[PDB]
Design a protein around this ligand. Structure first.
Ligand SMILES: *[C@](O)(C(=O)NCc1ccccc1)[C@H](C[C@@H]1CCNC1=O)NC(=O)[C@H](CC1CC1)n1cccc(NC(=O)OC(C)(C)C)c1=O
Ligand SMILES: *[C@](O)(C(=O)NCc1ccccc1)[C@H](C[C@@H]1CCNC1=O)NC(=O)[C@H](CC1CC1)n1cccc(NC(=O)OC(C)(C)C)c1=O
Lengths: 303, 303
């Protein structure tokens, strides 16, 4: 038993991490087969309004210093993939895992391997927020650090780090170089929109608390999907859908507590607070665990 | 910027993890050079009051099934090291990192690589509590999962998992097989003692909040080490020492806030609560970040 914010084991990703330098700019790259992926802004030098097309036409293969430990990698081709650069190199990464590029949805979680100069510093879990930001831990040099999920032996890469927004939250792309959210890889006035609480996740985490013997917030009441959503909206909670109710099925079954019964507990925590009590060691309602995360950790699925 | 519960990259440990079976009992082992370490209780079968000396005398090398992926490992020697078993095997782990066995102190943090059947499931950070338990996430089969720190390229192994106590907290040994706390690898009446809050860690985390621009709890007041400890004791907080004050030095310098000034903020949070506000996204005072953890993550030290 017990319930922790758990990241995927990072080894498979650590073996893909390289350093990419243009001029005085160093950041991280991801080396899979004979390609290195990094943020295209590695090629910026002065950048309120740069033209990346121009900047990339003016680069040559030999301008890109790529380092895998010591072993320098020779770049033999380059191309822009939206906001990512694909650096074709002369050698296929022998440590390349089974992998795929997947875009995630707001509410889904992934592990981040925070890297500096191609070197892994640490691993943590976060969620894609409803406003397409992530609440990460990123300093100067973390650009190109990636977010990922693991299923069996297969790494699903879902995020590459690009920037910090004024509120201290983070924005990036999928590995096809397409931004999550209305953000651009330029210095502009851009700010995170208003964020909401991921309702289905809070419900998953209340199920986790029950599976772990934290039961104090449970009540005999049930509510309707509509009367619940009436209260949720009031507190800046995402609407809950029949699809969400269906996804919470396995946890409903494991605990024998109907989803709409748990929604009655959530409505009451939203109206009355926790009255100086905690749930799974937290004094606030946690929303960065998906239904899958709770099943994975309360069942002991390995990779 | 940002501040997250960050684990060490786990790759170096993932390559050491093996499966160990005696009879119907399977758990995890740690394979370094030509030795596999696991909990000695792998040899129990019926165990209110077993004699392990007897149990081990009656085992043979061929009774121990050791599996590194598929590749079965041939056991050519065995011996008991306190509550750990050392299984001498015919082949040195080619993935053996630079490593050492270090015992940690209550208040210190480490990463856990939770494993099932020799396979890594996930990685999270926790602290050795003042009562020598850890608040982990462990199910049937997690025994032999290890706790570790990384410095440069060197893995300091500090914990091996053995059991869950009645309150849903976890107990284990160092890698020399010596228990943390007054616990034994038998079924008995044993329970965690009363736990305390790790004061020096709460202060480190308030420094982290300041470095991240969370400043609302700061005040113009200072307090004495003695008048602080008078309030702390009242709230089940560990006493703070001049050594603790000296360890918080670098964070004092970085923020220009004297330790005893921060203690005035902590005294006020203890007497008045947070008044429905949060610090680094928490509604309670966090005590599982060491001064080192805050410097490591607010400076971007890699491994
Ligand atoms: C990324 O470029 C990076 O890590 N680059 C390598 C590097 C940078 C600086 C010094 C040495 C090496 C960073 C990652 C950032 C740094 C701070 N935290 C992060 O997550 N990304 C940027 O600096 C990013 C590049 C833009 C997308 C093309 N960028 C540029 C300019 C401004 C900001 N942010 C900003 O102004 O935020 C506030 C909070 C307002 C200070 C930015 O992220
Ligand atoms: C460990 O032995 C293990 O993982 N063994 C392999 C295995 C066990 C069961 C089924 C298949 C394979 C476990 C780890 C435990 C399991 C649950 N959470 C954990 O952290 N350790 C034990 O089971 C431990 C062995 C004792 C030290 C020699 N043990 C034995 C008996 C009782 C308990 N705990 C217990 O009763 O806790 C409560 C909360 C009271 C149920 C125990 O941990």
């Amino acid at each position: 038993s017990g319930f922790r914010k758990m990241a995927f084991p990072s080894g498979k990703v650590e073996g893909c991490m390289v350093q990419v330098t243009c001029g005085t700019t160093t950041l991280n790259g991801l080396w899979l087969d004979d390609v290195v992926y990094c943020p295209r802004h590695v090629i910026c030098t002065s950048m309120l309004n740069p033209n990346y097309e121009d900047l990339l036409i003016r680069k040559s293969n030999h301008n890109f210093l790529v380092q895998a430990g010591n072993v320098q990698l020779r770049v033999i081709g380059h191309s822009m993939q939206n906001c990512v650069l694909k650096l074709k190199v002369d050698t296929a990464n022998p440590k390349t895992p089974k992998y795929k590029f997947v875009r995630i949805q707001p509410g889904q979680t992934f592990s981040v391997l925070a890297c500096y100069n191609g070197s892994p510093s640490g691993v943590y879990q976060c969620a894609m927020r409803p406003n397409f930001t992530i609440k990460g831990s990123f300093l100067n040099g973390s650009c190109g650090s990636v977010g990922f999920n693991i299923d069996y032996d297969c790494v699903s890469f879902c995020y590459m780090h690009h920037m910090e927004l004024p509120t201290g939250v983070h924005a990036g792309t999928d590995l096809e170089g397409n931004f999550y959210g209305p953000f651009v890889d330029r210095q502009t006035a851009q700010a995170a929109g208003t964020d909401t609480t991921i309702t289905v996740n809070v419900l998953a985490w209340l199920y986790a608390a029950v599976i772990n013997g934290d039961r104090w917030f449970l009540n005999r009441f049930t509510t309707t999907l509509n009367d619940f959503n009436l209260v949720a909206m009031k507190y800046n909670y995402e609407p809950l859908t029949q699809d969400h109710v269906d996804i919470l099925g396995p946890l409903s079954a494991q605990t024998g507590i109907a989803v709409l019964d748990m929604c009655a507990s959530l409505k009451e925590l939203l109206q009355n607070g926790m009255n100086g009590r905690t749930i799974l060691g937290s004094a606030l309602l946690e929303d960065e665990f998906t239904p899958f995360d709770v099943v994975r950790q309360c069942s002991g699925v390995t990779f």
